[PDB]
Design a binder for this molecule. Structure first.
Ligand code: CL
Ligand code: CL
Ligand code: NA
Length: 563
């Protein structure tokens, strides 16, 4: 059952009362197509270090008397026998008719990560938080916990700048403490599963940014997750000048932001290769956006793409813009749900859609106003399905579910009101994904690393290093725990994810052999590099770009099992 394809959707707690979000509530979720629903979002309490609700009223108090709760044309009433109302009541009520859809509480996000920084400071606070997550999923009928820490990285000035006062003093330890957090959550959740006779889940949404990942050395935490959701979006946007795709699939040598790097990194497939260092494909999910980012007054490019702009798209091209000071004056971002862009194209014949066959995503370009907005449509869904099948991926996650589209019951011909266009939210793309995931069948089980099938040798191989972008300097310690000297000319091999390129060994010689999502690096030492019994020898070299970890380590054609 763990090899089943997954279609994971984030539910926005905030949407049901917001015009720009379409007033999307739980009865608008794509229940027939999703396998998992991630409730966005919970946080960590600053004083108790326990899981806590963001909008408590929305989550457990709202009666929706002023809103339209209906599903399949039938009015949905809150279950009066539950001791809470809100979204959580509607979720549990719907779950009765969709018992195989898993519900998870997502903790964190861009604005909910702040108190993670102080909670991870001590093991007792981590224990308190993990225990509180168990209490919470029991109380509210959740099937698991999703951790969306943005970001547990040493990279200076990553994460929300509002939190620099907490993150910057902690950079050197965040990755280590995050690994303890995830491991502790797994331990507590597994115990609760046994106690309750339920199979509770632990998942995480994780960065796809090479910049953030340069400060994330230990990715062992991934092995404690039921699945790892790659946030393969927000690659490009109004924060800089590069008019490029929000969520490209394949590496694009024409992406101006990375044209000089050793390979194009701002695409799903680069992050896939990165995380293959620690996970099989069937535990990795592709992130899919149902929103846009964009620019206006675009200079150069072709249909805007690969042009430049210092002015993100504004006005009707930015209905999801953040309102920083409640003026109704939204920060330019070119950010829209997909249905709004469809409505804009109904009204403007010169707002046209184009296809990028390299990145395999669409984009929208207004040639008179010079407006470029990223996009997502049936063609990109089909390309994403092909990728998921080709790579044996676990499936996809969607950010956020109210951006999919369908026909609007409140359509008014000629209206420019946000919720009176031809389209509103719907399930067009999500149903198409679900159908394609069904058609391709379950994932294959990725075989174990081949090294475990080899004869053992009592040699310990330890791979460490330091990243100074774009250079990874590795140091490998090889300890001979046998009772005989190992002669020089020994070789060690390891599989290096194709997110990185082996550059040089500083001693001996090396070969590079293609091995799927990896290159097998074989380092052959010189005759003088004898390893005495109970002694350690260290070799170094250089790798370009970063990687989640290395795999399939061998020594002299055998499995190094250390001591
Ligand atoms: Cl179901
Ligand atoms: Cl297209
Ligand atoms: Na394709």
């Amino acid at each position: 059952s763990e090899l089943n394809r997954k279609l994971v959707g984030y539910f926005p707690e905030w949407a049901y009362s917001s015009e720009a979000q379409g007033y999307f509530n739980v009865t608008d979720l794509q229940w027939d197509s999703l396998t998992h629903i991630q409730y966005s979002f919970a946080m960590v309490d600053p004083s108790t270090n326990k899981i806590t609700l963001s909008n408590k009223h929305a989550a457990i108090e709202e009666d929706f008397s002023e809103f339209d709760l209906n599903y399949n044309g039938k009015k949905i009433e809150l279950d009066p026998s539950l001791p809470y109302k809100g979204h959580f009541n509607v979720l549990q009520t719907m779950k009765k008719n969709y018992p195989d859809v898993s519900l998870l509480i997502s903790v964190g996000g861009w604005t909910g990560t702040r108190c993670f920084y102080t909670m991870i400071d001590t093991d007792n606070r981590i224990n308190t938080f993990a225990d509180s997550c168990v209490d919470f999923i029991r109380k509210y009928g959740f099937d698991g916990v999703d951790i969306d820490f943005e970001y547990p990285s040493s990279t200076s000035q990553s994460g929300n700048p509002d939190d620099f006062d907490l993150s910057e003093p902690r950079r050197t330890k965040l990755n280590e403490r995050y690994n303890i957090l995830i491991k502790t959550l797994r331990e507590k959740i597994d115990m609760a599963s046994k106690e309750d006779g339920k199979e509770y889940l632990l998942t995480a949404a994780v960065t796809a940014s090479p910049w953030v990942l340069g400060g994330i050395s230990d990715n062992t935490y991934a092995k404690y997750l039921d699945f790892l959701s790659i946030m393969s979006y927000d690659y490009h946007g109004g924060w800089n000048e590069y008019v490029e795709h929000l969520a490209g699939i394949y590496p694009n040598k024409e992406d101006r932001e990375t044209v000089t790097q050793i390979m194009p990194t701002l695409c799903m497939d680069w992050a896939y290769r990165y995380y293959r260092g620690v996970l099989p494909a069937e535990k990795i999910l592709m992130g899919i956006p149902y929103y846009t980012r964009g620019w206006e007054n675009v200079q150069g490019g072709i249909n805007g793409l690969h042009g430049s702009s210092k002015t993100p798209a504004s006005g009707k091209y930015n209905i999801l813009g953040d309102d920083l000071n409640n003026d109704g004056v939204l920060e330019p971002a070119g950010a829209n749900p997909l249905w709004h862009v469809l409505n804009l194209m109904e009204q403007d014949p010169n707002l046209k859609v184009y296809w990028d066959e390299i990145s395999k995503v669409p984009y929208v370009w207004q040639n008179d106003k010079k407006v470029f907005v990223s996009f997502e449509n049936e063609k990109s869904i089909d390309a994403r399905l092909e990728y998921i099948q080709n790579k044996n991926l676990g499936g996809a996650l969607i950010w956020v579910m109210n951006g999919d589209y369908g026909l609007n019951p409140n359509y008014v011909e000629g209206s420019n009101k946000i919720n009176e266009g031809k389209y509103t939210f719907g399930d067009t793309l999500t149903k198409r994904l679900s159908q394609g995931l069904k058609k391709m069948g379950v994932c294959n089980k990725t075989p174990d690393d081949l090294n475990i099938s080899l004869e053992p040798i009592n040699v310990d191989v330890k791979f460490n290093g330091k990243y100074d972008h774009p250079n990874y300097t590795y140091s490998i310690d090889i300890t001979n725990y046998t009772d005989k000297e190992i002669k020089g000319g020994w070789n060690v091999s390891f599989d290096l994810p194709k997110s990185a390129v082996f550059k040089s060994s500083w001693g001996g010689t090396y070969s590079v052999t293609d091995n799927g999502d990896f290159n097998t690096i074989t380092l052959t030492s010189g005759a003088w590099q004898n390893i005495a019994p109970n002694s350690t020898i260290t070799v170094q070299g250089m790798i370009g770009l970063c990687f989640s970890g290395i795999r399939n380590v061998t020594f002299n054609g055998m499995n190094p099992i250390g001591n």
